[PDB]
Amino acid sequence: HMPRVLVTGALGQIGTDLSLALRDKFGADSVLVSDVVEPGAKHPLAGLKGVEKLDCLDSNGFEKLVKEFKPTWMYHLPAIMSVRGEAEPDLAMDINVNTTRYALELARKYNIRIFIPSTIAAFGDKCGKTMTKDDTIMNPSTVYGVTKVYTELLGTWYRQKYGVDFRSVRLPGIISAATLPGGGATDYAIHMYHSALLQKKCVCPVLPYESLPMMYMPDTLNSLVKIMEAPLEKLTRTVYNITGFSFSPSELRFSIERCTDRTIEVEYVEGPAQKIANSWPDSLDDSNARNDWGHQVKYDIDMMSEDMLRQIPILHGLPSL
Amino acid sequence: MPRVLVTGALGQIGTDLSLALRDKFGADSVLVSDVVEPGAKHPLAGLKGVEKLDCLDSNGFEKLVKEFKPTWMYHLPAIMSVRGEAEPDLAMDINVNTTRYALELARKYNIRIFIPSTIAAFGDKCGKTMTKDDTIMNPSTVYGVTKVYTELLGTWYRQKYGVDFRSVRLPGIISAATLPGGGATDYAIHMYHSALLQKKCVCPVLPYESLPMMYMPDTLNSLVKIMEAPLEKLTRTVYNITGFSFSPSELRFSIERCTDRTIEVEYVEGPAQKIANSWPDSLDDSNARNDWGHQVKYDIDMMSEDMLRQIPILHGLPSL
Numbered sequence A: 001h002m003p004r005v006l007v008t009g010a011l012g013q014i015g016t017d018l019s020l021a022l023r024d025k026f027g028a029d030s031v032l033v034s035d036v037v038e039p040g041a042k043h044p045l046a047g048l049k050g051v052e053k054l055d056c057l058d059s060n061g062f063e064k065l066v067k068e069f070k071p072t073w074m075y076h077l078p079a080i081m082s083v084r085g086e087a088e089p090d091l092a093m094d095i096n097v098n099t100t101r102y103a104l105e106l107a108r109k110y111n112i113r114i115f116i117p118s119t120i121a122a123f124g125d126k127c128g129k130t131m132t133k134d135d136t137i138m139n140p141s142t143v144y145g146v147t148k149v150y151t152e153l154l155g156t157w158y159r160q161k162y163g164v165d166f167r168s169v170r171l172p173g174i175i176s177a178a179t180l181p182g183g184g185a186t187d188y189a190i191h192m193y194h195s196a197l198l199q200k201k202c203v204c205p206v207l208p209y210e211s212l213p214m215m216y217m218p219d220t221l222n223s224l225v226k227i228m229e230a231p232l233e234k235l236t237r238t239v240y241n242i243t244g245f246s247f248s249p250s251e252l253r254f255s256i257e258r259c260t261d262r263t264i265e266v267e268y269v270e271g272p273a274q275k276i277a278n279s280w281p282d283s284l285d286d287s288n289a290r291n292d293w294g295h296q297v298k299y300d301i302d303m304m305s306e307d308m309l310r311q312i313p314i315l316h317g318l319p320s321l
Numbered sequence B: 001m002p003r004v005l006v007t008g009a010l011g012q013i014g015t016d017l018s019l020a021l022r023d024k025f026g027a028d029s030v031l032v033s034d035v036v037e038p039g040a041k042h043p044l045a046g047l048k049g050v051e052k053l054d055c056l057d058s059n060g061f062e063k064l065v066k067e068f069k070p071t072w073m074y075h076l077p078a079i080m081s082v083r084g085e086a087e088p089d090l091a092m093d094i095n096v097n098t099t100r101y102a103l104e105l106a107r108k109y110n111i112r113i114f115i116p117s118t119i120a121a122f123g124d125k126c127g128k129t130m131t132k133d134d135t136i137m138n139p140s141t142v143y144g145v146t147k148v149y150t151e152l153l154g155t156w157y158r159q160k161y162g163v164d165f166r167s168v169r170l171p172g173i174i175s176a177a178t179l180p181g182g183g184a185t186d187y188a189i190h191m192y193h194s195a196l197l198q199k200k201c202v203c204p205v206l207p208y209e210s211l212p213m214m215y216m217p218d219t220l221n222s223l224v225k226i227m228e229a230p231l232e233k234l235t236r237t238v239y240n241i242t243g244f245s246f247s248p249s250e251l252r253f254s255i256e257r258c259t260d261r262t263i264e265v266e267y268v269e270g271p272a273q274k275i276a277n278s279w280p281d282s283l284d285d286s287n288a289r290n291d292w293g294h295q296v297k298y299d300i301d302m303m304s305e306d307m308l309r310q311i312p313i314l315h316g317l318p319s320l
């Protein structure tokens, strides 16, 4: 049978495109998408059935929703990310720790296959910055990263103790056109496309040769589905690195200027994103993911930049050609 | 002379640590607290500067710290390996939230803060022989999971805010005064009691499962020394320390050498065994030795002599 899929924190950058892909793939009646906020008037999930409000900090309301829908899969997405978590750490520790605790308990009690994403932010400067391994020293420099190490370890314990089918990937920076990003260090990339279409100066808070692992949303969606469709027997671990390709702001800029045939104005003025990003790996080793469940990546930076420069005007109404 | 707050003070470590701090620094300079009040036979009963505080009551915790103005804090409340696997919601509440509250008070009220970690923070990928200070951490217990969180959170407080967070990964700690709180290494203490009562000891750790351990007097020396060290000596926030490693069969032999009497011990593969088997056999504590002079006086036989002398005195068990 097709799965019944619950998405929590579903209205954000990842949730928006994942929810659309799941409804398309499995049918709208087999998918329940939820978030603590309502879709805004321009949000692609506005006016649709199967969209609920849920604050995942309310464990009793989380249970009620799970009881009623009876999911077989859950993608638990709420988290406060790197830059915002440094400014709002008490909020990051509440959401990132307690919502995860609650989601895992419900996966236990209701026999749900549960995906909680981790992040390159779980790594710090001791990880081995080149082709970082799946198992290595983790010394995250942000409270977000600290909370995502805890997530990985706590999920893994739920699998060992109770047999909860917990699965996770360490996502790189995710690029998409649909929903603006939620305040991480990689957010500059999305913002540089908007500046280029508006012909405005881009003030980039990440320095020009700071390379980071990144991935374009279509590849991300294929992997998020693939890892959840895999039989449990095929998975040799609970947490996998995945990457798309790495780039620096200067490489992103060169790619956009190739597509628009048009020089863009960028000022590099260091923001908190920089020192955060500088502590992250430059690239990841994702061989285990490729071997166990078939992770792959089809987009390169120029393909991405062609697609983003097309989609942003369509979805957000900015000047195109 | 510092002003020292100890939370979780009525337990195995806190009982002895609290007495040692009062003796070194003066009773007037040491305030200790616990969620429970001490019973009439507790070593801390009847002493001034022993308060009732639930560290999950953040306003109460803040009130106490503000009034006393500690310069040092030892934050000891935690649910340990065996008990945490049976009561994991309590472990996650206590081990994560009280730690978060303690670090926030250390930041706001300028306190040098010690929070112990543990060998439980390691699992089967750590390199179980002479485990390094920096390695892969894959703990198999919710207690260990929460202690990796504690180390990484405390380290983030130091990097971000300049808070003087200090930690060691403690081995199994042996002492006579206060019975232990539900960890896998508790068999060791229980075997000395069984030997003195001449009862059969049912040991839930298999006979050759060796673990890092330390006797309390060495523990107390190091817990003070690390806190006294100047920052310029410390290259790390979290240090391994160890005393010596032993298995249950080794302990049994040490006890039988003292009493010249055989103890009846039945070994079984209990919950403790599956936990203990995931932990290191020995630790590399070279960084702690080099940076701040961690040192160990007791070996297994000295320890056993002292324990068999002290348990009768402190608990009324039959002597010799």
Ligand SMILES: NC(=O)C1=CN([C@@H]2O[C@H](COP(=O)(O)OP(=O)(O)OC[C@H]3O[C@@H](n4cnc5c(N)ncnc54)[C@H](O)[C@@H]3O)[C@@H](O)[C@H]2O)C=CC1
Pocket: A008, A009, A010, A011, A012, A013, A014, A015, A034, A035, A036, A037, A054, A055, A056, A057, A076, A077, A078, A079, A080, A081, A095, A099, A117, A118, A119, A120, A170, A171, A172, A173, A174, A175, A180, A181, A182, A183, A184, A186
């Ligand atoms: N965007 C990225 O590059 C990466 C994201 N991931 C992660 O994947 C996740 C989803 O990320 P994004 O979609 O980019 O974040 P986002 O910030 O765009 O979306 C997060 C959503 O969570 C919801 N939320 C916050 N608190 C909630 C609560 N108490 N209950 C229910 N919903 C709540 C928000 O309203 C929001 O719509 C996270 O766990 C994040 O760490 C990890 C790595 C990469």
Ligand SMILES: NC(=O)C1=CN([C@@H]2O[C@H](COP(=O)(O)OP(=O)(O)OC[C@H]3O[C@@H](n4cnc5c(N)ncnc54)[C@H](O)[C@@H]3O)[C@@H](O)[C@H]2O)C=CC1
Pocket: B007, B008, B009, B010, B011, B012, B013, B014, B033, B034, B035, B036, B053, B054, B055, B056, B075, B076, B077, B078, B079, B080, B094, B098, B116, B117, B118, B119, B169, B170, B171, B172, B173, B174, B179, B180, B181, B182, B183, B185
């Ligand atoms: N005993 C050992 O072998 C080892 C202990 N450590 C640790 O050192 C610590 C102290 O350990 P033990 O003395 O052996 O534990 P214990 O279980 O003997 O003492 C814990 C004490 O904390 C108190 N407590 C629990 N909840 C509290 C709360 N909400 N507010 C205030 N007090 C609360 C208990 O009443 C208690 O007296 C822990 O953090 C533990 O992880 C780490 C490694 C070795």
Ligand SMILES: C[C@@H](O)[C@H](N)C(=O)O
Pocket: A081, A082, A083, A119, A120, A121, A171, A172, A173, A174, A183, A184, A185, A186, A187
């Ligand atoms: C990389 C991921 O964790 C997120 N976009 C961040 O920058 O925090």
Ligand SMILES: C[C@@H](O)[C@H](N)C(=O)O
Pocket: B080, B081, B082, B118, B119, B120, B170, B171, B172, B173, B182, B183, B184, B185, B186
């Ligand atoms: C070793 C320490 O963490 C504790 N005595 C336990 O056995 O859990």
Ligand code: NA
Pocket: A210, A211, A212, A277, A278, A279, A280, A281, A282
């Ligand atoms: Na980097």
Ligand code: NA
Pocket: B209, B210, B211, B276, B277, B278, B279, B280, B281
């Ligand atoms: Na061991």
